[model samples]
Target: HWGYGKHNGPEHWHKDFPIAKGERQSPVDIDTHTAKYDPSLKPLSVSYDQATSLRILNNGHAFNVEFDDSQDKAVLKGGPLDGTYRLIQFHFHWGSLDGQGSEHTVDKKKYAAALHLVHWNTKYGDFGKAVQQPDGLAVLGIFLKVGSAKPGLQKVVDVLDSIKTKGKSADFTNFDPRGLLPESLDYWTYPGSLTTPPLLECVTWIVLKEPISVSSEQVLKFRKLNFNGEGEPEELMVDNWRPAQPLKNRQIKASFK
Candidate 1:
């Protein structure tokens, strides 16, 4: 029901999902100067299993790569988390243009795209149940800038042609998500919500400071995707990102000085 379109976009989301305007809504602009540096934060522990990757699909909102999270084969821990968070899936949010796309921003500046590696806390049992808890989910956000093509990301781009329409899916396995991450694990940590509806306020966001590169040509490939199904009128899946929300009274902590 909610989409990145004129009638039902982010602005209208609060009407259907009241929590869209909640205190802890996500994708907030990260003002570097304002982020408090904390020396107590431990370095994040990320170990991903290639075999955990299952498939890639066009979920109408964005292209998503689902994973087998039945176990902790792929997980993220430490760095503000109390327990292990199982890797569930990963997806992208981008703009129609190269100048803007990332859901979260640095100093109000936008990147070409952003990647979200969604994970759910093991303490909650399952993703469905996890979403109900305030600290149940941890999403790693990586900004994507337009530059040289990333070989790791290229592997994903190569499969885009197969899932061009909404609901389309294909088998995609043995892909380690770690390849998509930046060299440094330095990040800004905050308590936020899902950038999309039903905008659940249950995420502990870990946004990377350094961005990965992607060529302009590779970005064009993403625009080819359609939000509409095969039979419906063509609606290119572009600008699939939520704008930054108010910082409210929340404090953003940084792992780096």
Candidate 2:
């Protein structure tokens, strides 16, 4: 029922998901100048075991890299976080256009792509249960600029051709997510919701200030991914990013001086 097309875009999301109109919606424009630096925020701690990577799936929304969250194989701690968050899955949002695609805009600037590392609070036992609380989920956002070809991302892209159709999947393991991140650990944190349905307002967004690089050609290949199943008419998966929403009265705190 939800899609990034004319029939059911972000603007019409509130119709099915009321919280889409919630005050703490995600993909907000991060105006660095107006953001206050929080000295109290701790440095982000990311630890992952490559073996936890389960598989990759083309779920029609995007290519999701699922992880084995049964244990703390990969965990995100610190930086505006309260408890440990286990890595659940990771996905991307991009557009057909190279200059614009990322969900969150830094200084009102768009990027070629954006990566979402979805994590759930381990204290609650299950992701479904955790998502109902105020601090249930933590999503780490990493923007991708159009520049050098990111060698680290090639492994992910290579498997795309096999899972071009929706509902397709491939076994993916021993892949470390840390290799895809930028050098700097600096980030901006705020309260927000999932960019998609059920549009739950439970995510503690940690958006990296620094962005990684992906070749323009590589981004073009992402557009070739099909949003339709094998039996359905092919629809290229493009422009899968949610538009930046109003920040309302929320505060975007920075972890850098």
lDDT, candidates in the order shown: 0.93, 0.92
Q: How would you encode candidate 1's per-residue C-alpha lDDT over 1-257 as one tens digit per residue?
A: 98999999999998999998799999999999999999999999998853388999999989999999998899999999999999999999998998899999999999999999999999999999999999999999999999998888888999999999999999998888878989999999999999999889899999999999999988999999999998999999999999999999899999999
lDDT of 2 at 50: 41
Candidate 1: clashing pairs of residues: none
**Tens-digit lDDT track of model 2 for 108-210:** 8999899999999999999999889889999999999998999989999888999999999999988988789899999999999999899888999999999
- Single out the weakest 10-residue window by summed lDDT for candidate 1: 45-54
TM-score of candidate 1 relative to the true fold = 0.98
Candidate 2 has its poorest 10 consecutive residues by lDDT at 45-54
